[PDB]
A paper describes a structure:
Inteins (intervening proteins) are protein domains inserted into host proteins that are found in all domains of life. The more recently discovered and less well‐studied class 3 inteins, by contrast, form an internally branched intermediate in the first step of the pathway. The internal motif C2 : 4 cysteine performs a nucleophilic attack at the N‐scissile bond to give the branched thioester intermediate.
To increase the chances of capturing the intein with active site residues in relevant conformations for splicing we decided to crystallize the precursor and fused the AceL NrdHF fragments with inactivating C124A and N146A mutations. Five native flanking extein residues were included at the N‐ and C‐terminal sides, respectively. Expression of the fused intein domain in E. coli without the inactivating mutations resulted in quantitative splicing with no detectable precursor protein remaining, thus suggesting that the artificial cis‐arrangement did not have an impact on folding and function. We determined the structure of the AceL NrdHF precursor at a resolution of 1.9 Å. The intein adopted the typical HINT fold with the expected localization of the conserved motifs in and around the active site. The asymmetric unit contained two protein chains that form an inter‐chain antiparallel β‐sheet involving residues A12–K15 and come in close proximity at residues E140–G142. Electron density can be observed only for the two N‐ and two C‐terminally flanking residues in chain A as well as two N‐ and three C‐terminal extein residues in chain B, suggesting that extein residues further outside were disordered. All intein residues showed electron density including the three residues (GSH) that were inserted upon fusion of the IntN and IntC fragments. Cys124, in the structure mutated to alanine, was indeed located in the active site at the expected position within the motif C2 motif to allow interactions with both splice junctions and to act as the branch point residue. The distance of the thiol side chain to the carbonyl carbon of the N‐scissile bond would be only 3.0 Å, sufficiently short to trigger the initial N−S acyl transfer without additional larger conformation changes. Our crystal structure shows the M70 side chain centrally located in the hydrophobic core as expected.
Author numbering: -1 to 151
The structure:
């Protein structure tokens, strides 16, 4: 429902762990939406759901494959905002959050540089979700790029 495609890697203190393998005992790199600070915290819940539609955001080192009602996290003005994937409308003033290198350096890319595909999948597949106190956490795509994505509330 508010989930990420199976095999999405979640950045933890130890490395980049397949989301379907995350437990409540893992130390996940969260991003606090109120403070913009990075920290490792335990997820308070994990979710497994099977769906057949996906929103694929792709551009400029940003790649997320999410459920329709997954919370997308972006910066606008000086504030960190959320929007459901199916509702997100790119604009020059809304920026997705990339985390570059080993020092957790924030790079903000224009959402208008990110293509959005809404796909009906040929067959159902598993999507997974985490809840963390900061309400967002860092995922790593197939090309080693890290970005901030919404947690389930």
């Amino acid at each position: 429902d508010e989930a990420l495609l199976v095999g999405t890697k979640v950045t933890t203190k130890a490395g980049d762990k397949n989301i379907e393998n995350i437990t409540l005992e893992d130390e996940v790199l969260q991003f606090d939406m109120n403070t913009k600070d990075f920290s490792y915290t335990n997820p308070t819940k994990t979710q497994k759901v099977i769906r057949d539609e996906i929103y694929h955001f792709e551009g400029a080192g940003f790649d997320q494959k999410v459920s329709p009602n997954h919370r997308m996290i972006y910066e606008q003005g000086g504030e960190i905002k959320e929007c459901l994937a199916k509702d997100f409308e790119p604009s020059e003033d809304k920026y997705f959050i990339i985390v570059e290198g080993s020092h957790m350096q924030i790079k903000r890319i224009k959402s208008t540089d990110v293509k959005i595909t809404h796909t009906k999948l040929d067959e159902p597949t598993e999507f997974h979700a985490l809840s963390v106190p900061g309400k967002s956490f860092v995922v790593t795509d197939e090309h080693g790029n890290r970005s901030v994505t919404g947690a389930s509330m």
